[PDB]
Amino acid sequence: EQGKIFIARRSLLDELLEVDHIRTIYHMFIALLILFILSTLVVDYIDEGRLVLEFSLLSYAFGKFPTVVWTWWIMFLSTFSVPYFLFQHWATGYSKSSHPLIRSLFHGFLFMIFQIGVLGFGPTYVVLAYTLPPASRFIIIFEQIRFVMKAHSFVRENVPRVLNSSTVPIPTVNQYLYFLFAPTLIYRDSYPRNPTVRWGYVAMKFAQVFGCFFYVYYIFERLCAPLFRNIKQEPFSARVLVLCVFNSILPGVLILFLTFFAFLHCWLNAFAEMLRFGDRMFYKDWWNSTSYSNYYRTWNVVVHDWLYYYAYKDFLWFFSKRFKSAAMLAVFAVSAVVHEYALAVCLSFFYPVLFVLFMFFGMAFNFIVNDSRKKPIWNVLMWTSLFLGNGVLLCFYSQEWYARQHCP
Amino acid sequence: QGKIFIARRSLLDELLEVDHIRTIYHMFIALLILFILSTLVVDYIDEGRLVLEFSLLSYAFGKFPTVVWTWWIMFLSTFSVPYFLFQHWATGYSKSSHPLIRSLFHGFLFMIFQIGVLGFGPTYVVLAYTLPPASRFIIIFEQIRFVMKAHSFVRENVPRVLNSSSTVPIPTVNQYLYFLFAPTLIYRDSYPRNPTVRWGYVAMKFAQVFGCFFYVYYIFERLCAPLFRNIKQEPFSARVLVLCVFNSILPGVLILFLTFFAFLHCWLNAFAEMLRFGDRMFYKDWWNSTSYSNYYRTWNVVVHDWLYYYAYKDFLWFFSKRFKSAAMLAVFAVSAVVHEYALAVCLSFFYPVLFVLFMFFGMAFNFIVNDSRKKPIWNVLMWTSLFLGNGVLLCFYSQEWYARQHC
Amino acid sequence: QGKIFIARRSLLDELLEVDHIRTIYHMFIALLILFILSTLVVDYIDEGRLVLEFSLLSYAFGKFPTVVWTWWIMFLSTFSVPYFLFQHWATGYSKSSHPLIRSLFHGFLFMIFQIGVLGFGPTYVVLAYTLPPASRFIIIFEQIRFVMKAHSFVRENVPRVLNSSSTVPIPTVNQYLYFLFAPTLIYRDSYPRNPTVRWGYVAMKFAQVFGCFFYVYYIFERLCAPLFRNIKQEPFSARVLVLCVFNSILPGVLILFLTFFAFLHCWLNAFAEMLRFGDRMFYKDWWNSTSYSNYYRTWNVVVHDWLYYYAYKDFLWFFSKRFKSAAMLAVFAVSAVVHEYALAVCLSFFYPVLFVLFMFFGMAFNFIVNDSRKKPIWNVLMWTSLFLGNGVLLCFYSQEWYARQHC
Amino acid sequence: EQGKIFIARRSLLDELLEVDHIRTIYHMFIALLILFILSTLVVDYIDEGRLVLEFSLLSYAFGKFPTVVWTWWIMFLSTFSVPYFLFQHWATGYSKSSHPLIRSLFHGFLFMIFQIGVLGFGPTYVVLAYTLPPASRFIIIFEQIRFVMKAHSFVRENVPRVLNSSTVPIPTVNQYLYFLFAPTLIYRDSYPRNPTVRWGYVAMKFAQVFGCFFYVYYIFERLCAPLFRNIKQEPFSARVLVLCVFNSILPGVLILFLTFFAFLHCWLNAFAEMLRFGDRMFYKDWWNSTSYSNYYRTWNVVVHDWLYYYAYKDFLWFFSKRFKSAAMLAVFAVSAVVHEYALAVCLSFFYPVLFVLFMFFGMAFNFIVNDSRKKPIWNVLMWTSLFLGNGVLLCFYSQEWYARQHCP
Numbered sequence A, D: 001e002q003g004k005i006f007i008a009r010r011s012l013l014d015e016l017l018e019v020d021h022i023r024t025i026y027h028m029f030i031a032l033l034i035l036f037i038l039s040t041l042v043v044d045y046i047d048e049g050r051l052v053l054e055f056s057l058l059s060y061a062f063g064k065f066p067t068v069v070w071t072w073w074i075m076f077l078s079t080f081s082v083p084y085f086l087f088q089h090w091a092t093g094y095s096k097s098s099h100p101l102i103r104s105l106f107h108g109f110l111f112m113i114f115q116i117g118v119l120g121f122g123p124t125y126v127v128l129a130y131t132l133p134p135a136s137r138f139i140i141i142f143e144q145i146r147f148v149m150k151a152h153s154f155v156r157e158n159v160p161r162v163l164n165s166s167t168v169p170i171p172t173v174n175q176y177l178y179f180l181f182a183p184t185l186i187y188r189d190s191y192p193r194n195p196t197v198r199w200g201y202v203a204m205k206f207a208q209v210f211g212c213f214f215y216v217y218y219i220f221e222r223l224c225a226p227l228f229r230n231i232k233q234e235p236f237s238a239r240v241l242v243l244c245v246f247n248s249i250l251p252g253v254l255i256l257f258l259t260f261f262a263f264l265h266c267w268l269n270a271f272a273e274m275l276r277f278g279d280r281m282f283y284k285d286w287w288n289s290t291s292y293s294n295y296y297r298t299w300n301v302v303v304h305d306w307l308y309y310y311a312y313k314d315f316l317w318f319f320s321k322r323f324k325s326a327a328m329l330a331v332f333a334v335s336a337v338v339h340e341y342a343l344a345v346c347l348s349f350f351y352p353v354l355f356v357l358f359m360f361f362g363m364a365f366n367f368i369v370n371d372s373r374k375k376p377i378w379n380v381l382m383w384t385s386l387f388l389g390n391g392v393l394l395c396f397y398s399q400e401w402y403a404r405q406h407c408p
Numbered sequence B, C: 001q002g003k004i005f006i007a008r009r010s011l012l013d014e015l016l017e018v019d020h021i022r023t024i025y026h027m028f029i030a031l032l033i034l035f036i037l038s039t040l041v042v043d044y045i046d047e048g049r050l051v052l053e054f055s056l057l058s059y060a061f062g063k064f065p066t067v068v069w070t071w072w073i074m075f076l077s078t079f080s081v082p083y084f085l086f087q088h089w090a091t092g093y094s095k096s097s098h099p100l101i102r103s104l105f106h107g108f109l110f111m112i113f114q115i116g117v118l119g120f121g122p123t124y125v126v127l128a129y130t131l132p133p134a135s136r137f138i139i140i141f142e143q144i145r146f147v148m149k150a151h152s153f154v155r156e157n158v159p160r161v162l163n164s165s166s167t168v169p170i171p172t173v174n175q176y177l178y179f180l181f182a183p184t185l186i187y188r189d190s191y192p193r194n195p196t197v198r199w200g201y202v203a204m205k206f207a208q209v210f211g212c213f214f215y216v217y218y219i220f221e222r223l224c225a226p227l228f229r230n231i232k233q234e235p236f237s238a239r240v241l242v243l244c245v246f247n248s249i250l251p252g253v254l255i256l257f258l259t260f261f262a263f264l265h266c267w268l269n270a271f272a273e274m275l276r277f278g279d280r281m282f283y284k285d286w287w288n289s290t291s292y293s294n295y296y297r298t299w300n301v302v303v304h305d306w307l308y309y310y311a312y313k314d315f316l317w318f319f320s321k322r323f324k325s326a327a328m329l330a331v332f333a334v335s336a337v338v339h340e341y342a343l344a345v346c347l348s349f350f351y352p353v354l355f356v357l358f359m360f361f362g363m364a365f366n367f368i369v370n371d372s373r374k375k376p377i378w379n380v381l382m383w384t385s386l387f388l389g390n391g392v393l394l395c396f397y398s399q400e401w402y403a404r405q406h407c
């Protein structure tokens, strides 16, 4: 059935991390992390005297922070106010008059131009006018996509209701405000209250997300930054970009793992705890996934859920009756266009082949493990090829952005 | 009393096919192969040719034909003379003039065998040619194995015939040969028979032992041979010893895990598969262990079996069980002396305190994690202390070897 | 058609316990031990210390670790790839697109194995290091053994599956391993099982092989090494070659008898005893043989088995049986080529006429004693001609080697 | 029962030498003999040019041959005539008168003094007066012992007959003459005639005995003679007599084997064939023997038969009833005294410990193989000790004769 429920709970990691053997693997992992930190520290201190811990990169990336604070505030207030009261005025007087669609088309057009202009351009304008640095630029683009999807959902959950006729009204501002912070992207008025906020627990999760971000940042500064200088100096057509596409694979793996952990688990669980959300199914065991059709285990449930429900459904609805292939290619096209837009405006670089090559590689992997081929040789090969290929194309992307799209 | 076989599949096979752990495992193998491939193609581009040439291996293995002929001697000697002596002791018991003179003389002859043929033969042939400390390890390994199997083949049958009618059973040699190759150190005839030997399976396990030995070799050389030479040359001032302890951690734990795997799981399973042994209880889940007194979980059970059953029980029988703590101290002492002998003879260096400090460290760790603290903070601290302690103590050991004995 | 096992106890054991022959045997052993003791105590008094120091042995054995690793390679390779290839050929027969393309490709792969891995691998590894002509002998021995066992393991099963329902039987490998160690060269599963292995008996047989090898060594060195050096130095003029042929007779026949014993009786029985093989038909009574055409009595049957059953039968199948003589000539040719290859490669000398002249000599001897002459005069003349002929031809061979190739 | 019969036939070697495997061993043995001869010949000819074949030793040993011819002729005629006609006159008039033993004692004393003087001294006198060389001296002593035993047998076979009373007379001279050449030492008048004399067969046997004697002689000259020179020069107390007591063992074995073969087989079988004797059991398979008591397999049947029947029987008769040990020691003493006499008069040397030490060694061997010890280790040890010990004591005998009983 179509909808959203609250069965799964906690997460998908807190379920395991108290299974004895997995728990001890987890603790060994933490121990190796902390000993790697202490090793780098007290092996580049006694040898260079400085104990560097360079805080250069983020001090430039975060860039103009008060501007993103101010624009995020006005954007939150816009998304919190204008769609709410707009729909409020909308539904209350739906079929008192205007037996044709005139009222509908007109006000829906007002809403559409609101979204596209104010919520599409306003952020894009304030991010391309001041030539924002990517990190803060990424914050703005990210929150703008978030608010676009949340507004589309708040108006997708309630317009088929009022029209089927009593006439369901808009909900309380005291619940809309909450939905604007809920760890989800499907509007519901029904959210289960966990018993109590555990202030110690949310403090621990905030500590974990901040420590995870700082460890990500430190590993970056120490291992991915010097690579970036040495692809900074001579980037055009050296055959020694190979030297580092064979030298950032492992910290690329580490960054992937820790950014997933931090953002998809600690951040979301801490906000859930401060709000007592209840579901906490923010990710699936993506590593076990095998194929796209009917069996995909997304690594991000919120985005996959919104995507499926609000694009694929209505696309099979409108397009045709048996052209599933058309509708699936359509949801691929939607995801591709929005991802390319995000990454392009975020990295001042129009290079649209990244996502589509990602999907070709996903076809490759899924195929080489979806011929009923459980044989571990093929799983190991899939994993090596995943790591290697994502590193390869990451560095080719960084190269093309840095050399051929920098120099004439 | 008595050890009797039940279980199977070690722990790793059963544990792995749990899907999450199986994918963790495949990720680990992918990271290993990518690590070695990347390391290779990074130093083919920054140095020239391949930087792995198998240098230290040939110096380690050394006098191999010596070890093959001494292994045939030791094996043949263990196969015949403890067995022949025992079969001679066997038939004529309880017909003597004096009840025990036959025993005194006969057990004297057997002790002579132990201390001379297996106690001196191998150690003499290893200290004559001053063998390279790897093949020297092979020989001392085999020597303690054969000494323990002989002590077991006698302790498993002598008390049988002695108590009394046809009370004197003595087992066929055709079983003794099998036990000389069994994956255990308690003599038995009670070994079951998996339906077959799976040649594809032993092919895989032997390929796997070969690959893991090769890989530990690669890692060890490239990642701590330079550190070894540095701790050799200038070993006195604290700077380089700190620099070494704080860089001998990650490949340290890596080679530890890989050698534990390749030897306690893969090698033993290849052989037990070839001999259809059944009880593949070769290691308990070391990583979850708690403390010493009760419910200890050893990381290899065969030596733990022998130690418990053939030292603790018997020092109980020697001292009334009110001074059990005293009896317990001696098994500590036996384990200490045997390990100190092994390590010294294999490393031409008499440094006693290694094992006793390792035991004090294990005691401190058990104090950290036990008492049902179970707090992840204490467990993480225990793991960091284990890794770092193994590092620092290996390095202080290799220092006292490189410095204050070469100097 | 088909060889099937019946008999036992070679010939020597049964023949010996006839009392007269048993006492002849004990007299022989007494003369051997008295000969070596006397020889020793005569040259301890006329020279000083013991004159036996094992000089030429170490030069003969030479590159042993090379031969152990190439033996493991050859053994493993023979164990797996003929077997694996065959099991692959097995399951899918009679499902092909073209009836025989699968065969053409598959048999090509197997021929590739034979000629390259077993036809070149061992010969390449023997001619690379220019191995000493004793270990080189070990390797060529093992190589021809494994080639013949592979040809047999294929000729014993391919014609089975081919003729046609479940007509395709393919035997377990756990049997293939046993046949790779059996004392024969016709693959079978039909091997019986004497009740047990008799460890005292194999102890005796291995002590006996060791002693007989030692003794052939002693005799060979002391009695024809000086003659070897003399035929080396001045080999051209007839004087020393006459002097050598007329002194290479008695230790010649002695080492011949002793090596025949130690290898065809003792070694094979030790192994067949270890593997409980049963049919100990390892040699027919060579000394009573009569002629070639019919009722020939070979001195080792295993090679004779292979030769007859896998060359003569098949050249019958190639040429209609009216030119059987022509078919018979080819098995002569196959035996000649294989022996010439063995001897040349093992002795770095291409002298073809050795085997064909030995065959002409055997023909002349059979003409001497056969035709039911049976007169003791002709039999004695045959034996003198055999002993003397073996002597003279060995010496002309060693001359053409020492002289016209070193010169 | 006591007596002599004609069951066994041929010999004990002709029985085997047509068993296939033993036959081929025999032919290999002959081949090794002839090839050893050709080797010595054409390896000391091309190397020394002489092809020596020294005929020195026998030309001195045989010595005064016409004297032994003449004395053997007169001795044969004596043994052929005087005991015959003496007993003839004896028995014919036994109990016609002389009811007491006077006739008996008197004529028996005449016979006894005949034997001791004429047949004991006459040969001993003609061999010690001309100081005969051992070889011919050996012929004379040998034939004298032979004739003594034959006369004692001819008078032992017929005196208990005439006295038990008709009165059995002496036999025909035409049969006595035959008995004086029969290959035996127990007088019988009953000898089976084989069908025919095989002149080719007796020619072959004479060829075999002459070739055997010449091969014995050649091996002696070549291998035992140089040893004899090197114990000739410095014989007193060297410790290098050991060098050759460890260097004549094998040709001592060969001489033993070939002298046994030749004399006990070819000589006796050829004379049997020229006389068609019938028994031809001239030796037992002595190598298998194990002990003296009840189980001895003598290597010489004629002498063992005479010894037993004509010494042991009458010694148990006269001595006592249950003192078998006494009677056995008595036959040992008789054999010892006669053997020591023979060897002493033959080698101009009184050294009586040889035979008794032989018998102690025989005790040793028989004991170490008569404890039900079939184990081949003990049989091999017995054979090695037999060869070694007989060589040892042979050379100690030759030493003592040559050095301490030559020099003052």
Ligand SMILES: CCCCCCCC/C=C/CCCCCCCC(=O)SCCNC(=O)CCNC(=O)[C@H](O)C(C)(C)COP(=O)(O)OP(=O)(O)OC[C@H]1O[C@@H](n2cnc3c(N)ncnc32)[C@H](O)[C@@H]1OP(=O)(O)O
Binding pocket: A256, A260, A292, A293, A294, A295, A296, A298, A299, A300, A303, A304, A307, A308, A312, A328, A331, A332, A335, A339, A358, A359, A361, A362, A390
């Ligand atoms: C740690 C990750 C490392 C990754 C490394 C690279 C690996 C390769 C992959 C790389 C991905 C890109 C990564 C970029 C990251 C950027 C950064 C961000 O944070 S952006 C977020 C990015 N995440 C996406 O964009 C999701 C990617 N995938 C998708 O967009 C969709 O999930 C997609 C297109 C794969 C979904 O496909 P469906 O909806 O189109 O198609 P259907 O399953 O195949 O077909 C319809 C059938 O499925 C049934 N179905 C679907 N869901 C069902 C359900 N829940 N229950 C029952 N039936 C269901 C339907 O009922 C129908 O079957 P009936 O006809 O009914 O039999």
Ligand SMILES: CCCCCCCC/C=C/CCCCCCCC(=O)SCCNC(=O)CCNC(=O)[C@H](O)C(C)(C)COP(=O)(O)OP(=O)(O)OC[C@H]1O[C@@H](n2cnc3c(N)ncnc32)[C@H](O)[C@@H]1OP(=O)(O)O
Binding pocket: D256, D260, D292, D293, D294, D295, D296, D298, D299, D300, D303, D304, D307, D308, D312, D328, D331, D332, D335, D339, D358, D359, D361, D362, D390
């Ligand atoms: C190739 C040879 C190499 C030899 C190398 C050295 C080896 C060691 C030996 C070296 C010997 C010496 C060599 C010298 C050579 C010189 C040169 C020459 O040509 S000279 C001739 C020399 N040959 C002798 O002189 C014979 C040596 N032996 C003897 O003289 C006797 O044969 C002797 C003393 C051993 C015979 O002993 P019994 O007659 O004394 O004694 P009994 O068997 O032991 O006891 C009586 C019991 O045996 C029964 N008995 C005897 N014969 C029997 C039979 N045929 N059938 C049934 N019962 C029989 C009797 O009935 C009685 O037993 P109831 O009381 O009846 O139960």
Ligand SMILES: CCCCCCCC/C=C\CCCCCCCC(=O)SCCNC(=O)CCNC(=O)[C@H](O)C(C)(C)COP(=O)(O)OP(=O)(O)OC[C@H]1O[C@@H](n2cnc3c(N)ncnc32)[C@H](O)[C@@H]1OP(=O)(O)O
Binding pocket: B260, B286, B292, B293, B294, B295, B296, B298, B299, B300, B303, B304, B307, B308, B312, B328, B331, B332, B335, B339, B358, B359, B361, B362, B390
């Ligand atoms: C990958 C490895 C990681 C390395 C990192 C090192 C960190 C430090 C840790 C360690 C590494 C050491 C490195 C050395 C290398 C060696 C190489 C080898 O292959 S050797 C293997 C182990 N090495 C030993 O040295 C043996 C272990 N040493 C021990 O301490 C013994 O195992 C010991 C002393 C603990 C044996 O046990 P107890 O002496 O503590 O026993 P009681 O105190 O008598 O307690 C027994 C009680 O338990 C009951 N019990 C019943 N069933 C039991 C059972 N199955 N096991 C134990 N107890 C049982 C009995 O009924 C009894 O109770 P009631 O008090 O008498 O009433």
Ligand SMILES: CCCCCCCC/C=C\CCCCCCCC(=O)SCCNC(=O)CCNC(=O)[C@H](O)C(C)(C)COP(=O)(O)OP(=O)(O)OC[C@H]1O[C@@H](n2cnc3c(N)ncnc32)[C@H](O)[C@@H]1OP(=O)(O)O
Binding pocket: C260, C286, C292, C293, C294, C295, C296, C298, C299, C300, C303, C304, C307, C308, C312, C328, C331, C332, C335, C339, C358, C359, C361, C362, C390
């Ligand atoms: C200690 C040794 C002494 C050395 C001294 C040397 C002196 C000289 C003598 C030789 C030493 C050589 C030194 C070389 C070293 C080699 C090393 C080894 O390990 S190899 C071993 C032998 N060495 C060979 O070279 C193989 C023997 N060589 C041969 O000649 C073959 O054995 C050969 C050719 C004789 C095979 O037999 P066919 O070819 O003569 O057979 P057909 O003429 O076809 O007669 C077969 C007839 O017999 C019937 N038959 C029935 N059952 C039979 C059976 N069991 N055996 C044989 N024939 C049988 C059949 O039905 C057929 O009759 P139907 O004419 O077709 O009607």
